[PDB]
Amino acid sequence: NDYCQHFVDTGHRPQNFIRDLIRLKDELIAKSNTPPMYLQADIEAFDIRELTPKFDVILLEPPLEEYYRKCWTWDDIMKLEIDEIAAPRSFIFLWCGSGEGLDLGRVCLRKWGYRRCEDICWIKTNKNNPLDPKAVFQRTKEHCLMGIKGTVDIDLIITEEPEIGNIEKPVEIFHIIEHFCLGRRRLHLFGRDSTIRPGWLTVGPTLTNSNYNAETYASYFSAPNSYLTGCT
Amino acid sequence: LFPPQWICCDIRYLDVSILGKFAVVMADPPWDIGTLTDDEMRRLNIPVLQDDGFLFLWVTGRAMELGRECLNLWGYERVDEIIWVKTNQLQRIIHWLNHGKEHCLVGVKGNPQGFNQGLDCDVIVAEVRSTSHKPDEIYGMIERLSPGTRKIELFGRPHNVQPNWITLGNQLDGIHLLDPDVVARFKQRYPDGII
Ligand SMILES: CC(C)[C@@H]1N(Cc2ccc(C(=O)NC[C@]3(O)CCCN(c4ncnc5[nH]ccc45)C3)c(O)c2)CC12CCC2
């Protein structure tokens, strides 16, 4: 059965037709999860160095212009000082969309000094509702690239495409990130009120409330918790 | 000449100029991760094959970046990336993660025109037939985009022979050429007939 041909006919995307114990690691993640902390910041005009200590995971989710049919160009993004706040061995997940970010985002990663190890691809289904000039196909997926520095989950996330102008990323990304057990200092740049979450330090230009306190924060990782994988 | 044609050879030594110009180029190359070394990859004579047109380049692991290099080096801009979602006979999903997909870069050269941009969508779902195989569905997608036109595949295996397609592998069964202009430039470039 050919689904590329079917979509030509009906408008249902090939992905509209995919189908379908380890519950304890979720619980251990929860125990080791710090309080949620969330700091409002107009990140353009914000010195990243103020964000401390140095992070074990950085989830970066910049408002791409392409999300709307204040935006951040890749020109804008590629000039963040992400290396300054990463940790010697640490990770990064960068939402690139499907356009130039597929390429400019790899540049970024190399710039801040990461090398890619994973290409996690969000697949958007149009079950409940069957274009760049520079495009060739209907784009129906986004890429969240995963990079490392120093030193059971799959690389697919399938959900129904969100209502137009909804921009939130599928939360499963968090479950993929957290099931890796890469430490506890976690940072979600350009988060929003809506994404605040235990175990994470959200930082963004629309957060309507703030509780972040560099010192208060560091204390959660004061010895004897420095190198917790956060799954224990 | 509409039917398949193929050339068992070494794509590193064949005077690919004799093959002319193609609307679509596709390559499923054996990346060092048969093998070609990265320079051989860089050194391939892709730029002769197209004046205007599209290139489809399969990648895995770290070819994801090198392939973006070779793509750019040969003179294409990557415009789309295609994903293949690998399923079983009942439509379920067969380093740091387990991999449910393979990747295919799409590049563009010149000012190609007449194409049906937008006909299909950048995700593919089809059964994992055999190993190392790519799904016949890509020939669907590529036909609808530039129907009727000259297409050339590189590092094809004897199954990848297709109508309108000149396959180039080193497991192909000899040489089968029917297009005159090519059959021409071949005997002129190749008199005894070995590469
Ligand atoms: C996502 C893609 C990267 C991935 N690919 C990986 C792959 C697997 C098998 C073959 C293959 O065996 N191809 C036939 C062959 O003939 C055999 C020998 C080498 N090769 C040559 N042909 C002409 N001259 C040559 N000189 C040196 C080599 C040579 C071609 C291949 O090419 C690529 C497959 C995918 C598709 C999804 C996964």
UniProtKB/Swiss-Prot annotation, chain A:
<dbReference type="GO" id="GO:0003729">
    <property type="term" value="F:mRNA binding"/>
</dbReference>
<feature type="region of interest" description="Interaction with METTL3">
    <location>
        <begin position="19"/>
        <end position="20"/>
    </location>
</feature>
<keyword id="KW-0694">RNA-binding</keyword>
<feature type="region of interest" description="Positively charged region required for RNA-binding">
    <location>
        <begin position="106"/>
        <end position="115"/>
    </location>
</feature>
<dbReference type="GO" id="GO:0042063">
    <property type="term" value="P:gliogenesis"/>
</dbReference>
<dbReference type="GO" id="GO:0021861">
    <property type="term" value="P:forebrain radial glial cell differentiation"/>
</dbReference>
<feature type="site" description="Interaction with METTL3">
    <location>
        <position position="103"/>
    </location>
</feature>
<dbReference type="GO" id="GO:0005634">
    <property type="term" value="C:nucleus"/>
</dbReference>
<dbReference type="GO" id="GO:0000398">
    <property type="term" value="P:mRNA splicing, via spliceosome"/>
</dbReference>
<dbReference type="GO" id="GO:0045727">
    <property type="term" value="P:positive regulation of translation"/>
</dbReference>
<feature type="region of interest" description="Interaction with METTL3">
    <location>
        <begin position="134"/>
        <end position="143"/>
    </location>
</feature>
<dbReference type="GO" id="GO:0016556">
    <property type="term" value="P:mRNA modification"/>
</dbReference>
<feature type="region of interest" description="Interaction with METTL3">
    <location>
        <begin position="152"/>
        <end position="155"/>
    </location>
</feature>
<comment type="subunit">
    <text>Heterodimer; heterodimerizes with METTL3 to form an antiparallel heterodimer that constitutes an active methyltransferase. Component of the WMM complex, a N6-methyltransferase complex composed of a catalytic subcomplex, named MAC, and of an associated subcomplex, named MACOM. The MAC subcomplex is composed of METTL3 and METTL14. The MACOM subcomplex is composed of WTAP, ZC3H13, CBLL1/HAKAI, VIRMA, and, in some cases of RBM15 (RBM15 or RBM15B).</text>
</comment>
<keyword id="KW-0221">Differentiation</keyword>
<keyword id="KW-0744">Spermatogenesis</keyword>
<dbReference type="GO" id="GO:0036396">
    <property type="term" value="C:RNA N6-methyladenosine methyltransferase complex"/>
</dbReference>
<feature type="region of interest" description="Interaction with METTL3">
    <location>
        <begin position="98"/>
        <end position="99"/>
    </location>
</feature>
<keyword id="KW-0539">Nucleus</keyword>
<feature type="region of interest" description="Interaction with METTL3">
    <location>
        <begin position="116"/>
        <end position="119"/>
    </location>
</feature>
<feature type="site" description="Interaction with METTL3">
    <location>
        <position position="106"/>
    </location>
</feature>
<protein>
    <recommendedName>
        <fullName>N(6)-adenosine-methyltransferase non-catalytic subunit METTL14</fullName>
    </recommendedName>
</protein>
Swiss-Prot record, chain B:
<feature type="binding site">
    <location>
        <begin position="170"/>
        <end position="171"/>
    </location>
    <ligand>
        <name>S-adenosyl-L-methionine</name>
    </ligand>
</feature>
<feature type="region of interest" description="Interphase loop">
    <location>
        <begin position="89"/>
        <end position="100"/>
    </location>
</feature>
<feature type="binding site">
    <location>
        <begin position="157"/>
        <end position="160"/>
    </location>
    <ligand>
        <name>S-adenosyl-L-methionine</name>
    </ligand>
</feature>
<comment type="similarity">
    <text>Belongs to the MT-A70-like family.</text>
</comment>
<feature type="region of interest" description="Interaction with METTL14">
    <location>
        <begin position="77"/>
        <end position="81"/>
    </location>
</feature>
<feature type="binding site">
    <location>
        <begin position="10"/>
        <end position="11"/>
    </location>
    <ligand>
        <name>S-adenosyl-L-methionine</name>
    </ligand>
</feature>
<comment type="subunit">
    <text>Heterodimer; heterodimerizes with METTL14 to form an antiparallel heterodimer that constitutes an active methyltransferase. Component of the WMM complex, a N6-methyltransferase complex composed of a catalytic subcomplex, named MAC, and of an associated subcomplex, named MACOM. The MAC subcomplex is composed of METTL3 and METTL14. The MACOM subcomplex is composed of WTAP, ZC3H13, CBLL1/HAKAI, VIRMA, and, in some cases of RBM15 (RBM15 or RBM15B). Interacts with NCBP1/CBP80. Interacts with EIF4E. Interacts with EIF3B.</text>
</comment>
<feature type="binding site">
    <location>
        <position position="134"/>
    </location>
    <ligand>
        <name>S-adenosyl-L-methionine</name>
    </ligand>
</feature>
<feature type="site" description="Interaction with METTL14">
    <location>
        <position position="65"/>
    </location>
</feature>
<feature type="region of interest" description="Gate loop 2">
    <location>
        <begin position="128"/>
        <end position="136"/>
    </location>
</feature>
<protein>
    <recommendedName>
        <fullName>N(6)-adenosine-methyltransferase catalytic subunit METTL3</fullName>
    </recommendedName>
</protein>
<feature type="region of interest" description="Interaction with METTL14">
    <location>
        <begin position="91"/>
        <end position="101"/>
    </location>
</feature>
<feature type="region of interest" description="Gate loop 1">
    <location>
        <begin position="29"/>
        <end position="37"/>
    </location>
</feature>
<feature type="binding site">
    <location>
        <position position="28"/>
    </location>
    <ligand>
        <name>S-adenosyl-L-methionine</name>
    </ligand>
</feature>
<comment type="function">
    <text>The METTL3-METTL14 heterodimer forms a N6-methyltransferase complex that methylates adenosine residues at the N(6) position of some RNAs and regulates various processes such as the circadian clock, differentiation of embryonic and hematopoietic stem cells, cortical neurogenesis, response to DNA damage, differentiation of T-cells and primary miRNA processing. In the heterodimer formed with METTL14, METTL3 constitutes the catalytic core.</text>
</comment>
<feature type="site" description="Interaction with METTL14">
    <location>
        <position position="68"/>
    </location>
</feature>
